[PDB]
Ligand binder design. Structure first.
Ligand SMILES: Nc1ccn([C@H]2C[C@H](O)[C@@H](COP(=O)(O)NP(=O)(O)OP(=O)(O)O)O2)c(=O)n1
Ligand SMILES: [Mg+2]
Ligand SMILES: [Mg+2]
Length: 431
DNA sequence: ATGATGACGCT
DNA sequence: AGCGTCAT
């Protein structure tokens, strides 16, 4: 009772951009706005691979990883924007620059953890404390929360349209809120949501991009919350909402459980939903999934997680990769060297920009290859020192550390053919 | 023949 | 170090 911690100590948000690469392209080209639209890479293979899809196009069943030629079968009027190509490969600079626009705005409000090119976690615990004091003790108006859903509401005795349902739940929540108690976790979450409304308003005003967000007590619930009412809405998931929410929540939807661990939780325990984990002891879970995973699952199915919002706005690595599928797998030494040089040249440009922008230098170069006949992301990784931002030196060094994989007795030929090259700059130091 | 990335755990 | 998982 009095000593059972409830994981309600923090206010955490996750802000995720809506159909992000599409919005970047729609801002640039007004002809694409409010249309079924997708972003594709490499136009020559079946129209290009789709990597982002507007919500209008999603309505036709267009999805990521679809070939554009196939997407056009579902959506004849689908509009497309192509990823830039430079040095023979996709170049994602435009989307990285747009990401920086958004991350810099979020950073005005609180220290963020950059979690992907289009999302960040926010620890709003301190900002909420400050706002509660500035608030005399006055009630929180629904007008301060114009795009907020309260997960689980409305409920109970006694509209058929979306916005009507959103307001009814919000009214139930606010009507029941105690504002007298500055330490109520529900009150803290509500103030957190007010601040996220302000943050999302700033992002849209200053960039033109819309986003969604989740507000909860930890990263996993905030991430889950964010997706519940996409696009262009934010969702508050209270501690109290967790038992019903998890009662029918497939295990694979919780971050980190979407892969083999999640599958084994399902198979080994014979369950389907996150809430069903509560039936097991902490020791039982640890026996099946290990000390760390066991403890994490035991707490997480109760809505509790302690993973901190890390103070990190910048990527820890900078890398360049290219696949060479099927018949195009690299089979000559000079092929391998030309492409390593292409990669190294992009990497040099990004590293030099990074060193000017962020006062740091990378010190290790990691070279990864995939071999024809494998299936793994990487077949092989080798590292060496990164001592100069020079593409010719980097590409020469990368060849040095991988050139012995070449089983071919003939020196001009490469065997077995390479289906992927990857260069990654790592181990940054202040500069 | 998704592809281009990026974080972090394990031994 | 180098490999494996999970992720957008
Ligand atoms: N497998 C993936 C997933 C995302 N991305 C890129 C394109 C996406 O626009 C961007 C952000 O990914 P995302 O947040 O998962 N989805 P996106 O923002 O496009 O749509 P939402 O569902 O978030 O509204 O990363 C990618 O290149 N490969
Ligand atoms: Mg997104
Ligand atoms: Mg995202």
């Amino acid at each position: 009772g009095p000593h059972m911690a409830t994981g309600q100590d923090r206010v955490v948000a996750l802000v995720d951009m809506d159909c992000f690469f599409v919005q970047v392209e729609q801002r640039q080209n007004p002809h694409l706005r409010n249309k079924p639209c997708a972003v594709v890479q490499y136009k020559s293979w079946k129209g290009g691979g789709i990597i982002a899809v507007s919500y209008e196009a999603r309505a036709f069943g267009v999805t990521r990883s679809m070939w554009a030629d196939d997407a056009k079968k579902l959506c004849p009027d689908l509009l497309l924007a192509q990823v830039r190509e430079s040095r023979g490969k996709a170049n994602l600079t435009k989307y990285r620059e747009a990401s920086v626009e958004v991350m810099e705005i979020m950073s005005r409000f609180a220290v963020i953890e950059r979690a992907s090119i289009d999302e960040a976690y926010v620890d709003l615990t301190s900002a909420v404390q400050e706002r509660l004091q500035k608030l005399q003790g006055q009630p929180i108006s629904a007008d301060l929360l114009p795009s907020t859903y309260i997960e689980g509401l409305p409920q109970g005795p006694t509209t058929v349209q979306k916005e009507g349902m959103r307001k009814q739940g919000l009214f139930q929540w606010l009507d029941s809120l105690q504002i007298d108690n500055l330490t109520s976790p529900d009150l803290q979450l509500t103030v957190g949501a007010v601040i996220v409304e302000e943050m999302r308003a700033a992002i849209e005003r200053e960039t033109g991009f819309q986003c969604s967000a989740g507000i909860s007590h930890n990263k996993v619930l905030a991430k889950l919350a964010c997706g519940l009412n996409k696009p262009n809405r934010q969702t508050l998931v209270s501690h109290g909402s967790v038992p019903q929410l998890f009662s029918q929540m497939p295990i694979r939807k919780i971050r980190s459980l979407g892969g083999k661990l999640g599958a084994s939780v399902i198979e080994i325990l014979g369950i389907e939903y996150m809430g069903e984990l509560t039936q097991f002891t902490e020791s039982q879970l640890q026996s099946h999934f290990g000390e760390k995973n066991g403890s994490w699952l035991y707490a997480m199915c109760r809505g509790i997680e302690h993973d901190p919002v890390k103070p990190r706005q910048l990527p820890k690595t900078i890398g360049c990769s290219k696949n060479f599928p099927g018949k195009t797998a690299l089979a000559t030494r000079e092929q391998v060297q030309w492409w390593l040089l292409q990669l190294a040249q992009e990497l040099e440009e990004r590293l030099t920009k990074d060193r000017n922008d962020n006062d740091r230098v990378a010190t290790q170069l990691v070279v990864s290859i995939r071999v024809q006949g494998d299936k793994r992301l990487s077949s092989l990784r080798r590292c060496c020192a990164l001592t100069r931002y020079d593409a010719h030196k980097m590409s020469h060094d990368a060849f040095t550390v991988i050139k012995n994989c070449n089983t071919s007795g003939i020196q001009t030929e490469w065997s077995p053919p390479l289906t992927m090259l990857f260069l990654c700059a790592t181990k940054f130091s202040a500069s």
